[PDB]
Amino acid sequence: LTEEQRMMIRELMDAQMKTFDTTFSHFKNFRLPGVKVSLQLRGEDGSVWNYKPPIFSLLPHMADMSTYMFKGIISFAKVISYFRDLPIEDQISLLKGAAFELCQLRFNTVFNAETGTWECGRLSYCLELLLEPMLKFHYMLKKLQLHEEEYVLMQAISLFSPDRPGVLQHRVVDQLQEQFAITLKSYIECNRPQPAHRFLFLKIMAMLTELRSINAQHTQRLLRIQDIHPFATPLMQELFGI
């Protein structure tokens, strides 16, 4: 790995730890389904609130988690030099295209494939299959057992996609995305020699293509819900254009 590739991962890792509240400590004041996902809420005192689903009862809450997560993704991008050196218009166009993808890549780090639950600090999202592109993605990506460096690089590649509808400096964004892909490839060939990690780089690139597919599929479905039962917050509207 060259010094630049090293300074690249560091700038990415530094942006991650600064904007990723892995314990969801600042996530409060969120809506709950006032009386297929189980919801657990561990209290500091030791009390536990569990929710067993019965159908738009979880949209409000889920909308609060999204906004909280989205805010982390925006802060991540804005603290990255390669991102700030881009025209505001391109920052917005890129953020709207990767927003969901980066949230998923992040949710995967707190995903427990064993128990099939997202341990988000005090909160917990358990299931009640795998034919769902969403769940299959989380399980497959988890199986790869990636390092933190490999996750932030996946976020970089995703964020700096030149093919996002609205990008102007698609030439600059394209060169950046390539420098990020190369760094990931070099990092893998220099830290993971095990025969099991063969073709790892290409497996990661296929997952991102899957994520791009899942993302484009989600948007449509979310807009179909917003068309029937509005739930999107102001921030979710700025991103999905509503």
Whether residue 48 contacts residue 129, with contact meaning beta carbons closer than 8 Å, is answered with no
Give CA torsion, residues 186, 187, 189, 192, to 10 deg.
Answer: -170
On whether 100 is known to bind a ligand per the annotation, the reply is no
1-242 maps to CATH 1.10.565.10: yes
Reported as half-sphere exposure (CB side, CA atoms, 13 A), residue 31 has a value of 16
Residue 236 CB partners (closer than 8 Å, separation 6+): 63, 66, 67, 70, 242
- For 152, other C-beta atoms within 10 Å of its C-beta total 26
Resolution in A: 2.8
On whether 218 is known to bind a ligand per the annotation, the reply is yes
On whether 211 is known to bind a ligand per the annotation, the reply is no
On whether 213 is known to bind a ligand per the annotation, the reply is no
On whether 170 is known to bind a ligand per the annotation, the reply is no
On whether 107 is known to bind a ligand per the annotation, the reply is yes
Reported as half-sphere exposure (CB side, CA atoms, 13 A), residue 34 has a value of 3
Tell me, letter by letter, the H, E, C secondary structure of the chain.
CCHHHHHHHHHHHHHHHHHCCCCCCCCCCCCCCCCCEEEEEECCCCCEEEECCCCCCCHHHHHHHHHHHHHHHHHHHHCCHHHHCCCHHHHHHHHHHHHHHHHHHHHHHCEECCCCEEEECCEEEEECCCCCHHHHHHHHHHHCCCCHHHHHHHHHHHHCCCCCCCCCCHHHHHHHHHHHHHHHHHHHHHHCCCHHHCCHHHHHHHHHHHHHHHHHHHHHHHHHHHHHCCCCCHHHHHHHCC
